[PDB]
Amino acid sequence: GLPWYRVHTVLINDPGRLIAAHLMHTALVAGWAGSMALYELATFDPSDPVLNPMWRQGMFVLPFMARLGVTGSWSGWSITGETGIDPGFWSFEGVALAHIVLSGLLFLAACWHWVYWDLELFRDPRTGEPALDLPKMFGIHLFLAGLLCFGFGAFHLTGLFGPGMWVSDPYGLTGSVQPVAPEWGPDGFNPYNPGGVVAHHIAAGIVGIIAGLFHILVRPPQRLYKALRMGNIETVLSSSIAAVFFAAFVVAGTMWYGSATTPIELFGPTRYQWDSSYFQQEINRRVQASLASGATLEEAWSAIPEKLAFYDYIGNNPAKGGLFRTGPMNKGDGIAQAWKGHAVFRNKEGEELFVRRMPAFFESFPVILTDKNGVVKADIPFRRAESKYSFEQQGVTVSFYGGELNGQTFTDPPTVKSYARKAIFGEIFEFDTETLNSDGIFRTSPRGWFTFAHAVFALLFFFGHIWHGARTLFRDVFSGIDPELSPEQVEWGFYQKVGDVTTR
Amino acid sequence: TTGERPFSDIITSVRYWVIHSITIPALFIAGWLFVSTGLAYDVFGTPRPDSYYAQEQRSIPLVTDRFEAKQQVETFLEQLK
Amino acid sequence: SEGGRIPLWIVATVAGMGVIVIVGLFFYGAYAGLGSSL
Amino acid sequence: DWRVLVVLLPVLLAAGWAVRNILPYAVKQV
Amino acid sequence: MEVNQLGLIATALFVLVPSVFLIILYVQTESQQK
Amino acid sequence: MEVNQLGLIATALFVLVPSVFLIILYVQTESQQK
Amino acid sequence: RGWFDILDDWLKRDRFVFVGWSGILLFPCAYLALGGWLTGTTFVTSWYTHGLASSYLEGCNFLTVAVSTPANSMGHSLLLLWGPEAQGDFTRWCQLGGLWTFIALHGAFGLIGFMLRQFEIARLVGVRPYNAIAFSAPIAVFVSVFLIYPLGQSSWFFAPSFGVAAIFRFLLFFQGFHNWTLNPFHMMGVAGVLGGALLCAIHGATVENTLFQDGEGASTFRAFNPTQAEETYSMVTANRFWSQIFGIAFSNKRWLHFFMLFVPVTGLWMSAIGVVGLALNLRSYDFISQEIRAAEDPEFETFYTKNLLLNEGIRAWMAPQDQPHENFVFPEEVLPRGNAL
Amino acid sequence: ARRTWLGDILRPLNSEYGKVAPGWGTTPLMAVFMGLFLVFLLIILEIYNSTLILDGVNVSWKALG
Amino acid sequence: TITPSLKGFFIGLLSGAVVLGLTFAVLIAISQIDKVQRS
Amino acid sequence: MEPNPNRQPVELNRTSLYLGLLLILVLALLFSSYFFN
Amino acid sequence: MEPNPNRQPVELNRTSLYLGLLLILVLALLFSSYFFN
Amino acid sequence: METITYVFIFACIIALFFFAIFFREPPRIT
Amino acid sequence: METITYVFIFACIIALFFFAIFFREPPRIT
Amino acid sequence: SYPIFTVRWVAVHTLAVPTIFFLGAIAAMQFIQR
Numbered sequence A: 001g002l003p004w005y006r007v008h009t010v011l012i013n014d015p016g017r018l019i020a021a022h023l024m025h026t027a028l029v030a031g032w033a034g035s036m037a038l039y040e041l042a043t044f045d046p047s048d049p050v051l052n053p054m055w056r057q058g059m060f061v062l063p064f065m066a067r068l069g070v071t072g073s074w075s076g077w078s079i080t081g082e083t084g085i086d087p088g089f090w091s092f093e094g095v096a097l098a099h100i101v102l103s104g105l106l107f108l109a110a111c112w113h114w115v116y117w118d119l120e121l122f123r124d125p126r127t128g129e130p131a132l133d134l135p136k137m138f139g140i141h142l143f144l145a146g147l148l149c150f151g152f153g154a155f156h157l158t159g160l161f162g163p164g165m166w167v168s169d170p171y172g173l174t175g176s177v178q179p180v181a182p183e184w185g186p187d188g189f190n191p192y193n194p195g196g197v198v199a200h201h202i203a204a205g206i207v208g209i210i211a212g213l214f215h216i217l218v219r220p221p222q223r224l225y226k227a228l229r230m231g232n233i234e235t236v237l238s239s240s241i242a243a244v245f246f247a248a249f250v251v252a253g254t255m256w257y258g259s260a261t262t263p264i265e266l267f268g269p270t271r272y273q274w275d276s277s278y279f280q281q282e283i284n285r286r287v288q289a290s291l292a293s294g295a296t297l298e299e300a301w302s303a304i305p306e307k308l309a310f311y312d313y314i315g316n317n318p319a320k321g322g323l324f325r326t327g328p329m330n331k332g333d334g335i336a337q338a339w340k341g342h343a344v345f346r347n348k349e350g351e352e353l354f355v356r357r358m359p360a361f362f363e364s365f366p367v368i369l370t371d372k373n374g375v376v377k378a379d380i381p382f383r384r385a386e387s388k389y390s391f392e393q394q395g396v397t398v399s400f401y402g403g404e405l406n407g408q409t410f411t412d413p414p415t416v417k418s419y420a421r422k423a424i425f426g427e428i429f430e431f432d433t434e435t436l437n438s439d440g441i442f443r444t445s446p447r448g449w450f451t452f453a454h455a456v457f458a459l460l461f462f463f464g465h466i467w468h469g470a471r472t473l474f475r476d477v478f479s480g481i482d483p484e485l486s487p488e489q490v491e492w493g494f495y496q497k498v499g500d501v502t503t504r
Numbered sequence B: 001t002t003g004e005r006p007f008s009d010i011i012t013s014v015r016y017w018v019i020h021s022i023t024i025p026a027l028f029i030a031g032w033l034f035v036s037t038g039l040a041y042d043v044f045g046t047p048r049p050d051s052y053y054a055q056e057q058r059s060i061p062l063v064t065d066r067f068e069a070k071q072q073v074e075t076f077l078e079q080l081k
Numbered sequence C: 001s002e003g004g005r006i007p008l009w010i011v012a013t014v015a016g017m018g019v020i021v022i023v024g025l026f027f028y029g030a031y032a033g034l035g036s037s038l
Numbered sequence D: 001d002w003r004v005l006v007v008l009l010p011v012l013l014a015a016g017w018a019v020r021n022i023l024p025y026a027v028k029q030v
Numbered sequence E, F: 001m002e003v004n005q006l007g008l009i010a011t012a013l014f015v016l017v018p019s020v021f022l023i024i025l026y027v028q029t030e031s032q033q034k
Numbered sequence G: 001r002g003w004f005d006i007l008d009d010w011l012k013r014d015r016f017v018f019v020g021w022s023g024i025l026l027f028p029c030a031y032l033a034l035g036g037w038l039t040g041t042t043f044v045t046s047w048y049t050h051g052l053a054s055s056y057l058e059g060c061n062f063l064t065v066a067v068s069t070p071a072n073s074m075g076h077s078l079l080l081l082w083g084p085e086a087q088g089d090f091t092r093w094c095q096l097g098g099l100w101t102f103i104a105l106h107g108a109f110g111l112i113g114f115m116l117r118q119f120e121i122a123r124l125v126g127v128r129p130y131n132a133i134a135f136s137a138p139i140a141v142f143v144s145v146f147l148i149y150p151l152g153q154s155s156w157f158f159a160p161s162f163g164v165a166a167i168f169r170f171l172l173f174f175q176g177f178h179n180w181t182l183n184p185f186h187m188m189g190v191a192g193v194l195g196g197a198l199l200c201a202i203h204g205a206t207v208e209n210t211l212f213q214d215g216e217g218a219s220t221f222r223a224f225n226p227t228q229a230e231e232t233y234s235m236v237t238a239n240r241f242w243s244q245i246f247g248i249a250f251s252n253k254r255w256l257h258f259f260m261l262f263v264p265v266t267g268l269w270m271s272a273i274g275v276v277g278l279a280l281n282l283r284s285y286d287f288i289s290q291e292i293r294a295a296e297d298p299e300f301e302t303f304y305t306k307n308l309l310l311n312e313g314i315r316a317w318m319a320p321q322d323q324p325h326e327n328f329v330f331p332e333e334v335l336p337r338g339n340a341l
Numbered sequence H: 001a002r003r004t005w006l007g008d009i010l011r012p013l014n015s016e017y018g019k020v021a022p023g024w025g026t027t028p029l030m031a032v033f034m035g036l037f038l039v040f041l042l043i044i045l046e047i048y049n050s051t052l053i054l055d056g057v058n059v060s061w062k063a064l065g
Numbered sequence I: 001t002i003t004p005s006l007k008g009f010f011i012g013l014l015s016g017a018v019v020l021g022l023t024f025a026v027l028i029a030i031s032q033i034d035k036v037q038r039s
Numbered sequence J, K: 001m002e003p004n005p006n007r008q009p010v011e012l013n014r015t016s017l018y019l020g021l022l023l024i025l026v027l028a029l030l031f032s033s034y035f036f037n
Numbered sequence L, M: 001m002e003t004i005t006y007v008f009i010f011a012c013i014i015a016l017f018f019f020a021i022f023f024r025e026p027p028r029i030t
Numbered sequence N: 001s002y003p004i005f006t007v008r009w010v011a012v013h014t015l016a017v018p019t020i021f022f023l024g025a026i027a028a029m030q031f032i033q034r
């Protein structure tokens, strides 16, 4: 009988039952979407979009609902922290419900197409054999896709008839859903320009429509029909798998490097913002602007938004996790409660010292303090016997500005050391580690998990493509080679052209 | 066979060696001179033993700016007086 | 000219000796000049 | 640069030599 | 030790679901006419 | 809530083991000739 | 029989080195990757990217030469010769590490070329394309290690450099920073490679020691004819031998050879998945229960905690020279060290 | 096989199985488009990669505020 | 406006076009000359 | 080896499958609260 | 309803069962430590 | 996870209702 | 529970060795 | 009876010519002193 890994091949010549199986797959996926949204709603804490946003809480589908304009709950809250909003039906709950109902209907349709597989529609009218006109089908489906793409761009994203999309400032402080106008100049191909996403769906939509009509009205060249085996549905399987792993590598990339479609308020900051100290540079700029305007040190640092400071913290860097460190980021360092304020370290001579930050590569990292020129001034020693730079020897103190420890100064070596230890992670926060029994070990954000899943799946679908492409082009021999294969066909020099018996 | 002359034939033929007893040494000598004339250093930008550091410098000339990297290297080379 | 005039064994012996010579030179270089640690 | 001529004089002397020696058979082939 | 509490059921289903798949296929193969 | 931690695996196995027993028996019955 | 078909004719001629349509991609890219590696390792420095000598010209040997990755400051620049970094200058391009991306990219397209070659020749000869299919594992490994992994990290700098000792360094870096030996995907990789080697060995030896006497020679290689119909060794004897020695044995030759494809190909694929994880620092670095116990209990020791101490040493002692762009200065007193050493 | 109303409607859309245009047909044109598409991808890659840098195109979070 | 890197892009584009074109010109020419004999 | 003459084929018809699964699932629905306690 | 002509019997021989169970059990032995973490 | 368990079992029961009704072995008169 | 799980999987594997060897499908010559 | 300038010839020389040149270079390098 069929081996276990071939059971589904019974679908190859049964268009009706193939459609049933696809309906069932679609039902399962829609059902997964519904279920996932329900679970996230049952676990999501909406009370603090500043220090406890969705990406700290292991939310995976919530940011995708938010990206396209679903930001409210029937229960009255919004992901931007508003209250007393009426989201209408299309709340998170509404979306979940819609997906569940869709799943049900698809299930039922699947049953019908499974039972009534033998429709005349699936029969070649000349031969009576099952047959699908794949090139014309491609035309039809591409036309439809083009319509839908165009409409998504022209109506949804523009806000012309729809909510728009998530946009934000360059530091992800004030994100919200807005209508976006298409950008038709070169900056449209800038990944950080949303106008480009709009323009894309409009233009690629129109192109999809034109090309769709082309593929509906014009038959394939015989030479391509033969070369790509267009009578064989597995060829479509191969090229579709190729298209899909391409798409998957792309979304993995734009998730990891960031773009207008992977906002940091929805997925968390990127690793490269930590690498280049993006947020720290902005914070320092603001503080300096404040001081230059006549503010005090305490005033300048207190004017820094907690949200901004929280971005400047390595616990939110997606490159600090673990493959089997499961769950939300809150399960690691804890649920962030408050900024402690900016720590300034000084030695006994009153020189300001700066803690060397941990690079993402390192699970652990030493504690080293330098002056503004990178000269080592203090550290926490391993071996003590020849220590020169201990906090005790150098009389290191730490004063805080802004946040909850604002205006306070600490001089006892243990406390100063503890804060130095925290300064290697960037800005310092107070965490609730009790509510979730957090274990103090960094976990990655949804930016990380999405990127991982999709790079892996992409890589695997490469093999899928290879396998099904092979199955397509070698259909004649995949039960074995011609038992009467003449030795002359593989001997050397018998034919002038390899495998061409007409060239003896 | 595939129509070409057997290598056994070729490499044991007199003519082959008349040709290659010239062409192989010529190439060898060419490469030799590519090094001995110092041209290699300049084609590939490789430091001679006295061009890794200026006399009292002990800092690697590491490239640190992507788009003005070229100018950085040029500056580093000027720094060898 | 005609093939087989020079005995394949002589060619093999000479070629082989040449290889031993050049490799020998490279190992010599491990102990002299650059890369010698000296 | 005189060094490129001093270095690539062997290569071109070799190419010229073998061209000279293989010319009749090459013409016969072509 | 403070292990992951889902580890047990994770391991149990990881073993049982596909093993059961295989056992089902095997038994119904044996029962086919010889 | 503070539920018994084995309740989950207990329930899962309570369902799966006899369900699977039945599924094996049913499928090998269907696969018999006639 | 127009120009396309004439060209097809010529491409597919049965010559000493088969060309094919795939050859148009394969031969230039493979030639440029090999040539680039030889050019770089013979003549090109890594002073400006790593602070390393890396060529025969500088005094390196076969074990220590490499074509090294670009500086970390280059990020993931394609680093094209005509690009904004080198701006057409061949020498500066070499100094900036252009040959690394040159080799990795021409190499990637060359590997595509080679696998296409496998398909094309299989199709022309009339065999199933399982050789190409098996070659998907080399592809997965190359793409995950040389492309995906650095693309996940800060820059091309942390890709493997093309050299023997350079690769050894890549290994040690992965141990120290990723605890890669702990990773179950790497472990599956190891099982596939060592298992592949085992199957190679045992199958070769078994065939050679269950041969039928098909000649009078004491040297038995001549007593075989490629055109012969008969198995050249006894599968029945082989089966009884291994059944009585190991408890189980192959009885089916087709399954045997498919299995020989399956083990190492699958192993390499799994290792690829692991490296894709390491691209994001998504490591199997720790066992959380281990750490909680060990943190609270200073007498609790396992080989896992021992190896983490080793990793910590590797990181602290190798980072300043291995990562020069970071400008690490680790004073003596902070270096982790056991007693005396 | 079983006919239905909707089936009868859609019948023409699935009746031209195996129908081809003679020879190479529109392959040359197809080729042109593929060529263009290649160049197109090359452009966006290089823009994202900062290998291709255009006025008014700042590839950063600081693109637009 | 044509920036230095856009100019460079055109140079790469053109160079690749020249390489591919020369390659196929030579291949097609050789194929035209040395034809496979059939009967 | 001589085949054993005492062997007998086993059956579970579809209706018995449905009854059995109903029994198991409903028993689980009943006892699970007590399992979590 | 008329029978579907595309049906095929499925098989898993005993050796495949043993191999499959080995793969599953050994994968479990490998991955379980990581699931418990 | 308790809630998930209860809902899961309930859902399986409803699914079973569907199969037991629409995919029953059809009664046949002899 | 962890220890029990590890030892249980191991034990199942040993049992499997036993059946794969002594209760294998016998190889038969055709 | 045999051609001289073949695809094989080209392949062979694209490898052999650079190889001999390179070996000349590395040879020279053995006499470089710091």
Ligand code: CLA
Residues within 6 Å of the ligand: A004, A005, A006, A007, A008, A009, A241, A460, A461, A463, A464, A465, A467, A468, A471
């Ligand atoms: C669009 C996606 C897609 C589709 C529709 C198919 C369809 C098919 N595949 Mg292909 N394939 C794909 C992608 C796809 N494949 C990918 C990504 C890979 C690499 C992993 C492969 C590698 C592959 C091989 C090696 C083979 C096939 C075969 C087949 C055919 C028989 C399948 C079968 O009966 O399995 C039966 C499968 C089972 C009974 C159980 C499988 C359980 C899996 C391993 C674990 C659980 C998966 C999990 C439930 C899925 C989660 C969703 C996913 C998105 C993560 C069928 C035409 C077979 C074939 O060609 O036969 C002639 C075959 O030998 N495929």
Ligand code: CLA
Residues within 6 Å of the ligand: A026, A027, A029, A030, A032, A033, A034, A036, A037, A061, A062, A064, A065, A068, A070, A095, A099, A102, A142, A145, A146, A149, A204, A205, A207, A208, A209, A247
């Ligand atoms: C009926 C219409 C409909 C609508 C309005 C929605 C709406 C939504 N879905 Mg649901 N969904 C639906 C049907 C629908 N869905 C169906 C039928 C399924 C089963 C397949 C799903 C399965 C599903 C999952 C698993 C998820 C959602 C999610 C969502 C939300 C995020 C949307 C998103 O980011 O997609 C992004 C869409 C794309 C990136 C489309 C890519 C298109 C590719 C590139 C096309 C390639 C081929 C094409 C032919 C190329 C040529 C085109 C041509 C123009 C050139 C959003 C509320 C997410 C969510 O938030 O769940 C709660 C989520 O995780 N949906």
Ligand code: CLA
Residues within 6 Å of the ligand: A040, A043, A057, A058, A059, A060, A323, A324, A325, A326, A327, A328, A445, A446, A449, A450, A451, A453, G266, K027
């Ligand atoms: C696209 C896939 C995807 C991604 C990126 C996410 C992402 C996330 N999920 Mg979601 N989820 C998904 C699909 C996904 N999910 C699916 C399909 C389900 C249904 C089961 C869920 C149900 C779910 C729940 C219940 C929860 C999450 C949670 C989360 C968050 C934590 C992730 C985590 O800890 O994983 C850990 C990842 C691993 C441990 C990797 C596993 C690797 C496998 C085991 C390897 C398999 C090896 C294989 C056997 C080898 C075979 C070899 C053979 C071929 C020879 C994260 C944001 C958590 C959360 O925080 O919610 C708020 C949470 O509680 N998810």
Ligand code: CLA
Residues within 6 Å of the ligand: G024, G025, G028, G029, G032, G078, G079, G080, G081, G082, G098, G101, G102, G103, G105, G106, G109, H035, H038, H039, H042, I010, I011, I012, I013, I014, I015, I016, I017, I019
């Ligand atoms: C088929 C074989 C092949 C392939 C696939 C590649 C591929 C590559 N080469 Mg290699 N190379 C090759 C052969 C090949 N090369 C040969 C034979 C040589 C010797 C001349 C080189 C010498 C070489 C150098 C010196 C460099 C490369 C580089 C590259 C990389 C960048 C190329 C690029 O961006 O082109 C862009 C151009 C195209 C893709 C051409 C497409 C043309 C379209 C389809 C037609 C339209 C053209 C249009 C009419 C032109 C109008 C121009 C006008 C506006 C002025 C890429 C991986 C670069 C690299 O690796 O940097 C790290 C690099 O510096 N190559």
Ligand SMILES: CCCCCCCCCCCCCCCC(=O)OC[C@H](COP(=O)(O)OC[C@@H](O)CO)OC(=O)CCCCCCCCCCCCCCC
Residues within 6 Å of the ligand: G204, G205, G208, G209, G218, G219, G220, G221
């Ligand atoms: C003579 C040199 C021996 C070198 C060491 C042994 C090599 C062969 C051992 C492999 C065992 C495999 C398991 C049994 C496999 C098995 O059953 O073998 C079977 C095979 C065939 O046996 P025959 O009976 O036909 O011939 C062997 C005798 O009976 C004499 O005729 O044996 C040989 O071919 C012997 C080859 C001698 C020459 C081999 C030299 C190869 C190594 C050269 C050195 C390389 C070093 C590289 C380092 C950089």
Ligand SMILES: CC1=C(/C=C/C(C)=C/C=C/C(C)=C/C=C/C=C(C)/C=C/C=C(C)/C=C/C2=C(C)CCCC2(C)C)C(C)(C)CCC1
Residues within 6 Å of the ligand: A028, A029, A030, A031, A032, A035, A100, A101, A102, A103, A104, A105, A107, A108
């Ligand atoms: C009938 C009906 C209905 C209902 C319906 C419903 C209720 C449905 C549901 C549905 C559902 C509720 C569904 C669900 C689904 C799910 C899924 C499908 C999942 C899957 C999963 C997976 C596949 C996973 C995997 C994994 C794991 C496990 C681990 C890690 C890794 C991975 C991720 C791979 C209504 C009333 C509406 C109406 C009509 C009728």
Ligand SMILES: CC1=C(/C=C/C(C)=C/C=C/C(C)=C/C=C/C=C(C)/C=C/C=C(C)/C=C/C2=C(C)CCCC2(C)C)C(C)(C)CCC1
Residues within 6 Å of the ligand: C019, C023, G031, G032, G034, G035, G036, G037, G038, G039, N014, N015, N018, N019, N020, N022, N023
């Ligand atoms: C990169 C590049 C390019 C290319 C170039 C080329 C392509 C080159 C080639 C080159 C070459 C192609 C070279 C070669 C070399 C070779 C050598 C250097 C060899 C050596 C050898 C030896 C040393 C041996 C050894 C041994 C062994 C192996 C085993 C046996 C024993 C003995 C020990 C003898 C171009 C211009 C396009 C552009 C720019 C960039």
Ligand SMILES: CCCCCCCCCCCCO[C@@H]1O[C@H](CO)[C@@H](O[C@H]2O[C@H](CO)[C@@H](O)[C@H](O)[C@H]2O)[C@H](O)[C@H]1O
Residues within 6 Å of the ligand: A001, E017, E020, E021, E024, E028, E032, E033, F023, F027, F030, F031, F032, F033, F034, K008, K009, K010, K011
């Ligand atoms: C919770 C995890 C559980 C995992 C469960 C996985 C479910 C797997 C279901 C397997 C389905 C088996 O499908 C079963 O195939 C056999 C043959 O193989 C069919 O059997 C058919 O073929 C045989 C052989 O010609 C005939 O003797 C028999 O009369 C005929 O009906 C059954 O009609 C079908 O029911």
Ligand SMILES: CCCCCCCS[C@@H]1O[C@H](CO)[C@@H](O)[C@H](O)[C@H]1O
Residues within 6 Å of the ligand: A086, A087, A088, A089, A090
């Ligand atoms: C199957 C569930 C159907 C439930 C329908 C409830 C309609 S609810 C209704 O929806 C409108 C559109 O968003 C809103 O404008 C309005 O405020 C809201 O009350």
Ligand SMILES: [Ca+2]
Residues within 6 Å of the ligand: A437
């Ligand atoms: Ca605790």
Ligand SMILES: [Ca+2]
Residues within 6 Å of the ligand: N033, N034
């Ligand atoms: Ca000197």
Ligand SMILES: [Mg+2]
Residues within 6 Å of the ligand: C028, C029, C030, C031, C032, C033, C034, C035, C036, G059, N029, N030, N031
């Ligand atoms: Mg030397």
